[PDB]
Amino acid sequence: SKGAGKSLVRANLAIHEPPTGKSTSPGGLIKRFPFEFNPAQLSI
Amino acid sequence: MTRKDPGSSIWFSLAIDGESLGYFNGCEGLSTQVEVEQRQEGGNNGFVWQLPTRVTYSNIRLTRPLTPDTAKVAKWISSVQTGIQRPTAQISALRADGSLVARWGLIDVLPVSWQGPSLDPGSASVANEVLEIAHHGFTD
Amino acid sequence: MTRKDPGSSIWFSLAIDGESLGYFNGCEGLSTQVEVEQRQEGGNNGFVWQLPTRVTYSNIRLTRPLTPDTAKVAKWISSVQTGIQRPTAQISALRADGSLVARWGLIDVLPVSWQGPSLDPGSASVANEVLEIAHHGFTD
Amino acid sequence: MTRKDPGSSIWFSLAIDGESLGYFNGCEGLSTQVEVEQRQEGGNNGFVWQLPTRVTYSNIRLTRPLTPDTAKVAKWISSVQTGIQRPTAQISALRADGSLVARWGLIDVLPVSWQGPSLDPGSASVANEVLEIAHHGFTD
Amino acid sequence: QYTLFGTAGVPIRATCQMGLVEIPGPTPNRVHRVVAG
Amino acid sequence: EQFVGSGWSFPLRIGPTGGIALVSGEQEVEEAMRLILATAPGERPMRPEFGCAIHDLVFAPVNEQTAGRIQHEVYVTLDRWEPRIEVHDVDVTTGEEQNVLFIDVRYSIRGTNNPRSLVFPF
Numbered sequence: 001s002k003g004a005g006k007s008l009v010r011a012n013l014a015i016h017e018p019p020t021g022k023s024t025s026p027g028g029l030i031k032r033f034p035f036e037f038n039p040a041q042l043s044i
Numbered sequence: 045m046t047r048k049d050p051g052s053s054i055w056f057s058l059a060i061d062g063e064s065l066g067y068f069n070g071c072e073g074l075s076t077q078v079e080v081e082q083r084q085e086g087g088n089n090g091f092v093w094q095l096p097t098r099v100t101y102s103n104i105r106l107t108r109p110l111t112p113d114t115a116k117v118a119k120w121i122s123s124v125q126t127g128i129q130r131p132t133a134q135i136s137a138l139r140a141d142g143s144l145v146a147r148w149g150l151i152d153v154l155p156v157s158w159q160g161p162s163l164d165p166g167s168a169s170v171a172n173e174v175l176e177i178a179h180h181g182f183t184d
Numbered sequence: 185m186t187r188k189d190p191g192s193s194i195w196f197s198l199a200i201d202g203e204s205l206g207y208f209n210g211c212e213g214l215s216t217q218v219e220v221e222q223r224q225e226g227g228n229n230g231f232v233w234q235l236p237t238r239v240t241y242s243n244i245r246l247t248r249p250l251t252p253d254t255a256k257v258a259k260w261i262s263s264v265q266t267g268i269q270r271p272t273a274q275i276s277a278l279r280a281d282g283s284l285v286a287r288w289g290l291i292d293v294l295p296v297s298w299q300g301p302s303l304d305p306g307s308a309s310v311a312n313e314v315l316e317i318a319h320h321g322f323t324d
Numbered sequence: 325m326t327r328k329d330p331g332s333s334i335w336f337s338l339a340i341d342g343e344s345l346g347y348f349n350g351c352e353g354l355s356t357q358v359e360v361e362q363r364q365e366g367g368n369n370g371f372v373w374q375l376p377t378r379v380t381y382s383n384i385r386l387t388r389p390l391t392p393d394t395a396k397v398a399k400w401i402s403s404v405q406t407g408i409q410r411p412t413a414q415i416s417a418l419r420a421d422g423s424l425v426a427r428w429g430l431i432d433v434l435p436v437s438w439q440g441p442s443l444d445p446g447s448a449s450v451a452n453e454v455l456e457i458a459h460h461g462f463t464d
Numbered sequence: 465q466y467t468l469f470g471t472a473g474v475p476i477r478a479t480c481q482m483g484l485v486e487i488p489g490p491t492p493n494r495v496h497r498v499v500a501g
Numbered sequence: 502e503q504f505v506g507s508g509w510s511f512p513l514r515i516g517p518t519g520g521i522a523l524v525s526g527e528q529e530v531e532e533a534m535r536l537i538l539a540t541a542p543g544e545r546p547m548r549p550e551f552g553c554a555i556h557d558l559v560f561a562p563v564n565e566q567t568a569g570r571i572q573h574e575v576y577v578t579l580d581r582w583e584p585r586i587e588v589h590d591v592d593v594t595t596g597e598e599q600n601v602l603f604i605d606v607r608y609s610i611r612g613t614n615n616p617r618s619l620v621f622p623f
Binding site for chain 1: 083088
């Protein structure tokens with residue numbers, strides 16, 4: 001009942017160019033930034 | 045192997061240069077640590093990363109029997125008002141033959157404390173002034 | 185069961201890989217703690233829930249007689265400026281027969297402290313340098 | 325009336341269920357505490373009211389001789405990454421005859437620390453691994 | 465925050481705090497049955 | 502509870518009497534989803550954003566990081582273009598050894614709360 005099930009994945013930060021015209025979804029990717037250490041705690 | 049020649053903790057040689065402090069009689073606490081910094085990966089339990097940052101040397105307590113040449117030490121310590129001097133010190137451990145096992149040296153010393161003799165009418169011992177020493181690195 | 189073969193604390197073998205540290209002489213403190221977070225369920229009295237959280241491995245203090253090969257350790261420690269190699273250590277417990285009881289190993293190591301010999305003109309013993317090792321996961 | 329002598333500190337029986345940890349050899353610190361809350365009545369000097377609040381159970385340190393079956397406890401501790409199990413364990417005190425004086429049962433078990441053997445070339449003893457354990461409640 | 469500056473000036477250890485705020489994604493562009501009760 | 506309307510059908514058949522048959526009800530929702538998810542974005546130049554972009558995550562490693570981004574791609578597209586459908590989880594199970602990535606979407610028309618899963622029957 002799992003996907004990859006058993007693997008470790010590094011959290012990454014995706015940066016997209018801002019929308020230009022009458023649009024809401026972000027444009028194409030410009031730089032994908034992979035972490036060196038996943039955050040210890042995340043506050044929402 | 046010539047039956048080796050393992051180090052011991054009786055034969056030694058302790059000295060300070062510069063001001064006529066002379067040769068001391070007992071070392072202690074000669075040590076060098078590393079300030080590790082622990083960061084915990086969020087998504088991977090079971091361990092904590094051990095990242096190595098810097099290195100810190102600790103103080104040294106040198107003791108010797110109280111001799112009339114203790115006036116030099118008090119002169120050295122109380123010279124900080126008019127300018128201090130950092131000579132170069134040595135700490136060496138020897139076997140009985142007088143050979144060399146491991147010769148350390150102190151790059152730059154600095155007084156820290158001077159615990160004088162513990163005078164007592166009953167105890168049958170000998171006055172042992174203690175001269176703490178600050179550190180700057182090992183010579184090579 | 186051939187009268188069993190229970191482990192003891194005299195026969196062993198301590199070693200560090202990589203730099204020519206050689207084989208040490210005495211271990212201590214090999215431990216794996218598990219941090220537990222206590223949440224007090226306010227509804228009912230009678231206990232506090234215990235929930236596991238992460239696994240942390242404590243430091244290990246290794247000691248050996250002071251031998252001329254101690255220059256390697258100081259070189260290793262003072263290499264943090266140019267980068268540290270992290271070899272894989274090994275801690276093992278044996279019986280007098282020389283067979284194995286349970287062999288542990290350290291995935292990655294890091295010097296933390298090096299308490300040098302305590303030179304003393306009176307006390308009769310062998311100078312025992314102390315090397316402190318940072319830790320990572322257990323090998324398997 | 326007969327002589328129902330009480331639980332000597334020698335005869336016992338210690339065990340853990342579930343993961344094949346087997347039977348242990350020593351126990352310490354089995355205790356239950358309550359956290360009283362003290363409110364000082366303002367208008368009345370003479371005492372401070374004592375009011376009970378919750379019940380908590382302290383951790384236990386179980387020790388056994390180091391045997392090749394120590395691979396299980398190390399595996400059990402490291403299982404927290406992929407899911408842990410709380411087996412139900414027992415602590416009993418007996419007399420010489422092997423009868424029962426008072427049998428306690430840990431409702432749920434969680435490892436906390438595992439202080440491994442203290443290897444020493446000089447000391448003449450036997451390696452005693454120390455497996456801590458997190459209480460969860462008393463059975464009945 | 466920058467700590468443990470390696471020799472010759474390059475920083476080695478850096479800690480940064482990020483503050484993110486969600487951008488809404490709006491504009492996504494009644495028959496009822498009758499039971500006995 | 503929510504009006505579903507009526508329309509044509511993706512594989513369109515002549516019908517019982519002629520013309521083109523019309524499908525409505527819970528069945529019709531499948532065809533709207535089938536069209537929405539099958540086509541990549543950019544297939545219809547006039548409406549570029551329409552069409553879920555699954556193919557951007559082809560040949561990625563089999564990690565829940567990939568299945569993590571898969572979940573988001575369906576969620577936005579299935580909601581932006583099909584508002585009559587309330588989505589209830591998407592399941593990414595490899596199956597048949599780690600070489601393919603199945604997608605199981607559970608949904609329900611709003612208010613009717615009849616759980617249902619898109620099957621994509623060939």
